[PDB]
Design a protein around this ligand. Structure first.
Ligand SMILES: CCCCCC(=O)SCCNC(=O)CCNC(=O)[C@H](O)C(C)(C)COP(=O)(O)OP(=O)(O)OC[C@H]1O[C@@H](n2cnc3c(N)ncnc32)[C@H](O)[C@@H]1OP(=O)(O)O
Ligand SMILES: CCCCCC(=O)SCCNC(=O)CCNC(=O)[C@H](O)C(C)(C)COP(=O)(O)OP(=O)(O)OC[C@H]1O[C@@H](n2cnc3c(N)ncnc32)[C@H](O)[C@@H]1OP(=O)(O)O
Ligand SMILES: CCCCCC(=O)SCCNC(=O)CCNC(=O)[C@H](O)C(C)(C)COP(=O)(O)OP(=O)(O)OC[C@H]1O[C@@H](n2cnc3c(N)ncnc32)[C@H](O)[C@@H]1OP(=O)(O)O
Ligand SMILES: CCCCCC(=O)SCCNC(=O)CCNC(=O)[C@H](O)C(C)(C)COP(=O)(O)OP(=O)(O)OC[C@H]1O[C@@H](n2cnc3c(N)ncnc32)[C@H](O)[C@@H]1OP(=O)(O)O
Ligand SMILES: NC(=O)c1ccc[n+]([C@@H]2O[C@H](COP(=O)([O-])OP(=O)(O)OC[C@H]3O[C@@H](n4cnc5c(N)ncnc54)[C@H](OP(=O)(O)O)[C@@H]3O)[C@@H](O)[C@H]2O)c1
Ligand SMILES: NC(=O)c1ccc[n+]([C@@H]2O[C@H](COP(=O)([O-])OP(=O)(O)OC[C@H]3O[C@@H](n4cnc5c(N)ncnc54)[C@H](OP(=O)(O)O)[C@@H]3O)[C@@H](O)[C@H]2O)c1
Ligand SMILES: NC(=O)c1ccc[n+]([C@@H]2O[C@H](COP(=O)([O-])OP(=O)(O)OC[C@H]3O[C@@H](n4cnc5c(N)ncnc54)[C@H](OP(=O)(O)O)[C@@H]3O)[C@@H](O)[C@H]2O)c1
Ligand SMILES: NC(=O)c1ccc[n+]([C@@H]2O[C@H](COP(=O)([O-])OP(=O)(O)OC[C@H]3O[C@@H](n4cnc5c(N)ncnc54)[C@H](OP(=O)(O)O)[C@@H]3O)[C@@H](O)[C@H]2O)c1
Lengths: 286, 288, 286, 282
């Protein structure tokens, strides 16, 4: 059964958009030094965007910024920023505008998470997650938005959440709550700031080869109809699409990128997929 | 006519729905219980026999309300001063709750703050203030009560009051929409995670409840967007709350109930603006 | 105490009438599928509370036996009318008889349904169509006809549709049901909006499994409340929604599932079996 | 610059092909209602990008004129097959022909629909049933038949249903449509889960109003204009492409923000101007 999934759901890990389509465009990406943020930056730069990446670890940031800069031939700028601090965010936005200009693409990708029984969390642990995910995305959006309105310019905004932002989930509760907050913000500002030329969309990723929580991966895939984890390149292509001018009428959308995981686990009778064809013949007799 | 039809068939029943003394021996904890919706909920639960404990920042109003309800129902209402955004204040509040009344059977997360403002006019501190009261406050209260319930091998029904815009978003109330959305995801998360400890979690999403008013013309415009043709009442909301926090709803867990007179379905439906089309105009349209 | 004991102690079913004696005096209720299972349960409670109930379904014999049984129990007369809801002519006659024998309904419960549990590939076009007809078209026809008569008479009513938790999420193996049930949900939200000016409000209950081969025990493991629901509990919820206490509840969709949907839908809820001791080891890794 | 100027500048439609030239070569696409409007636009893009297209609907004349017109424009052959989707036999015969003239589909688009805008109380039972039959049962029959054939041939495909933003919310005045479309969404999510093992994936686009008087609805669209057929086609093509091979069970709004605008309780405050907001905070 995995031969059908491998042949018909095989990943296409190369650029989807036309060459140089992001030339003249400036992108700002929180968490752009690692994992998903890095892949989005990698693609946007390769397609001609001037990228600006921000997070806490300047060492990883600079290394990644230089690595992509030489790989694509387009300059990637690194700026140190803790998104939960409004003054640092203010500085980062100001520096973004000086070294690159007002952004056409804003990607809120920075996150933190604990996997834990909720009863083992301290108030500070809870607050930490809310600060990075919700308030951090809020501060970045508030400041850039304020500058864009000031400069009579618009932009595409993108927030990366999770499939559990919409459903909730035990064991990742502060994240689930913060991420749900991030989605509500996108929907709110898609409505409010459309008049300013700003649009807001969301990707809800399932487990991507970077999941979280050798035998565990095999178990995870059993809950994924597409029979595999996602890839950073595939996610980047989706992100680039939503941040591109081809999607200029996509606003307030929320797109699952999960190989079908959410629809599988959420469906009441989907546990019946374990039933074999011979067993079904017996049940259909009654 | 429309007005007389709505008034007759959507008439508010503002009396206790549940059987008298149905909450005897139960203890309820209500954040924001001193005013508005919290007060209405406290008043009903106390009237039905519950021992209530109400918590908020303003001790004077909280004490006044607690004494007012106590005298009306003959059941004690305890006031405790608490800023829910302060985890240490929350810890001491829950500690006092357990000593004065007992472990709660009912926990109502009702305290909130809001600004109506263009988002561009908000400071980071204004945004954070709302997130702090709504999301972190409800989290801190839930976390600490939950910890004490698990320790005590006891369960409880939890209720969070959100808004119809928690699920949809809304411009002009963005910090609130975000924080209230977080509150809903928390309820769904802990309905699942903590069912095994005897805790269940539900949500009511209220539309506008009768509680800038000036001419009264704004209310007239608000009602045009409500199918039921009126604002809701505190007593009706309280009945819904009491039901969800009652043993009759012991199998209701992770539910989200709109209490809005049909407002959300009206405004969200793409072609609902066609309600302003007359019978005559429809005749010509159906003839095209 | 263990999980089971906490669930038993703190989610115990209260299977007696919730609303005050005689609260439905002078109310007429129309309940499709009112002769068996959930429909019979709702009919029993409404009648006991004073309503004049009219039940309608295909099997006149089962319908008559139920109507007699409830009439003798409660003292209040329950009328039985033979109706296949997918037949619009039969629905017309049924509503005409309803108005003649009882009066214009104050409560309309669309409860009749059909369902197959089967791999979708095994379904014939007729098998699919059969489910759509009973569930979606049947609820539509009953709703259209009563609505037309209520508008004519300048009378209002509370409408209630019983769907399922999988109407919102979808689910394999019950696909025609999921589609038809989702349709029934959209209908309620649509008419909640459209027909408020006529004094008609529309709400929905989404039930999980309600108690009536070892799979019963298996379902419970996916229910945070640790048991199946009961008919009496569902009836209480139904009565509340169809009562004047809920006269401002309109367009609501209420899960009645012991937390099943939130449990199965949450990505990390598969970690629920990890014990106190095992969690210490996981936290040691992070 | 004013609202209309920013909206036009930063939400300008890009109506050219997004995906790489010939990216759909060796792929067969089956589109219901492919002879007109949105179906026509998706067929045109898929054919121009190299796909072998098959279109199916009731009106053979239009279904031949569009197919010939696309064939000559793109150079790639488009086949026309008469099919009323609400009839299982016509569907079965249509699936058999699709496999004969082109082969097993790699792309299935369920786009065919019918609608009335009417107060619900003026609808006959037949009028309701018509919409349910075309939209829900029609999509079901097409999906069931093609699905069955793909399982038998051990072949996979990407499925795409075009619904509406009101499928999720419901809406007065379009009730049979809202219901049937809601059902189509549920079907997609259901089969996304059920048929993963068969290599079949299912997604949904929910469009707002597309430019194919009624222009005051633009005041309810944050992006400040109606959408275009070419923009929708680009989104549709992406979802039906191998670039989207891990996208499954998704529902994408393509509405310029209309749904979030109308559904948000306080969004009716959008006309309040800069000057007016000062006194409110006092
Ligand atoms: C497939 C689905 C994927 C889903 C993923 C997502 O949705 S988003 C995932 C995004 N996040 C990540 O990938 C990783 C996230 N985070 C981490 O790896 C790291 O743990 C971290 C960056 C959050 C560390 O945070 P900080 O450096 O700010 O330090 P932190 O705030 O944790 O330390 C202070 C408090 O946290 C508590 N703390 C520390 N680690 C903890 C843990 N594992 N579980 C619980 N609590 C913890 C301490 O007890 C302390 O409490 P006291 O102050 O009371 O003494
Ligand atoms: C019908 C449906 C309704 C929906 C309702 C809901 O969802 S919730 C319903 C709640 N609705 C309400 O009417 C709430 C009203 N009031 C309250 O909840 C509370 O009294 C309160 C939030 C004002 C209390 O505030 P606190 O004392 O906790 O904190 P405080 O407001 O001082 O925080 C400081 C920041 O607030 C900002 N601030 C204060 N008023 C503001 C205003 N009207 N508009 C914008 N910003 C404001 C200041 O600029 C300051 O930022 P700087 O320090 O950077 O300068
Ligand atoms: C356990 C959990 C339950 C959960 C339930 C729910 O959520 S909702 C609950 C609703 N229903 C139920 O729980 C249970 C049962 N419901 C019913 O039995 C329904 O009333 C009913 C549809 C069977 C009754 O309608 P009919 O008598 O018209 O059905 P009938 O079988 O005559 O319809 C003719 C077509 O059905 C097909 N058919 C019958 N059984 C079938 C099956 N198990 N799998 C596939 N197809 C089947 C026949 O092949 C035939 O197609 P052809 O002519 O092409 O050969
Ligand atoms: C913004 C728009 C979004 C739209 C979304 C979509 O998905 S579709 C987009 C809009 N386009 C369309 O809807 C196109 C076509 N829609 C259709 O419903 C159909 O294809 C069609 C009616 C034109 C043709 O179907 P038929 O051959 O069955 O035509 P027929 O006239 O027999 O239709 C059957 C029933 O429709 C009823 N009917 C026709 N017009 C009606 C109207 N304006 N209001 C109420 N009812 C009407 C008739 O009375 C009849 O019921 P009786 O026999 O009882 O008298
Ligand atoms: N990978 C998956 O399978 C998966 C699944 C679902 C959702 N997601 C989402 O996708 C996004 C990226 O995931 P990922 O796995 O790639 O993340 P990651 O690489 O593991 O790390 C998170 C990123 O956020 C930055 N960050 C953390 N705290 C910050 C702070 N306070 N201020 C500024 N930046 C901060 C980090 O940089 P610094 O350490 O230098 O600060 C890092 O680049 C996240 O939003 C996540 O929720 C991922
Ligand atoms: N009324 C409506 O039409 C409506 C509509 C939608 C949603 N809601 C929701 O319903 C709930 C009640 O609304 P309401 O109108 O009754 O509110 P309210 O009376 O105007 O006041 C909110 C309550 O929360 C308390 N509170 C505020 N900040 C607090 C904090 N930091 N710590 C502890 N308590 C705090 C206040 O008491 P103190 O000042 O003493 O702290 C007050 O009792 C809220 O959750 C609201 O979001 C109401
Ligand atoms: N029981 C559960 O655990 C559960 C779970 C989720 C949802 N539900 C929902 O709850 C409702 C009641 O379910 P139930 O368990 O009570 O099922 P049930 O006992 O089998 O009752 C189904 C009823 O529908 C009637 N019916 C079937 N086809 C009809 C038609 N063509 N015209 C008129 N009536 C028809 C039947 O009466 P006739 O045979 O005489 O026609 C029967 O009374 C259904 O809507 C179901 O989808 C139940
Ligand atoms: N245009 C918009 O602004 C808009 C907005 C939201 C959603 N949509 C959705 O987009 C899709 C296409 O809409 P459109 O605007 O392109 O409408 P359209 O131009 O009128 O196309 C509808 C198509 O469906 C076909 N059709 C109707 N009944 C059929 C049947 N019984 N069997 C087979 N085919 C049938 C028609 O072909 P024949 O007449 O030859 O049978 C026609 O090509 C629809 O699903 C619609 O719901 C459109």
């Amino acid at each position: 059964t995995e031969a059908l999934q491998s042949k018909f759901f095989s990943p296409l890990q190369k650029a989807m958009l036309p060459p140089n389509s992001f030339q003249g465009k400036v992108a700002f990406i929180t968490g752009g030094g690692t994992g998903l943020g890095k892949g989005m930056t990698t693609l946007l730069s390769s397609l001609g965007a001037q990228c600006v990446i921000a997070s806490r670890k300047m060492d990883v940031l600079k290394a990644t910024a230089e690595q992509i800069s030489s790989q694509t031939g387009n300059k990637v700028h690194a700026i140190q920023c803790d998104v939960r601090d409004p003054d640092m965010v203010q500085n980062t936005v100001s520096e973004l505008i000086k070294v690159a200009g007002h952004p056409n693409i804003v990607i809120n990708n920075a996150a933190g998470n604990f996997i834990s029984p909720t009863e083992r969390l301290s108030p500070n642990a809870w607050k930490t997650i809310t600060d990075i995910v919700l308030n951090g995305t809020a501060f970045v959006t508030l400041e850039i938005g304020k500058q864009l309105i000031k400069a009579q310019k618009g932009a595409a905004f993108l927030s990366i959440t999770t499939i559990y932002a919409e459903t909730g989930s035990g064991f990742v509760v502060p994240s689930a709550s913060a991420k749900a907050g991030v989605e509500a913000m996108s929907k709110s500002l898609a409505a409010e700031w459309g008049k300013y030329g700003m649009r807001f969309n969301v990707i809800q990723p399932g487990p991507i080869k970077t999941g979280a929580f050798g035998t565990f991966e095999k178990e995870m895939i059993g809950r994924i109809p597409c029979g595999r984890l996602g890839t950073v390149e595939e996610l980047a292509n989706l992100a680039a699409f939503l941040c591109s001018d081809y999607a200029s009428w996509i606003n307030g959308a929320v797109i699952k990128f999960d190989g079908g995981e959410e629809v599988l686990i959420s469906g009441e009778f989907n546990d019946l997929r374990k039933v074999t064809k011979e067993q079904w013949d017996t049940i259909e007799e009654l």
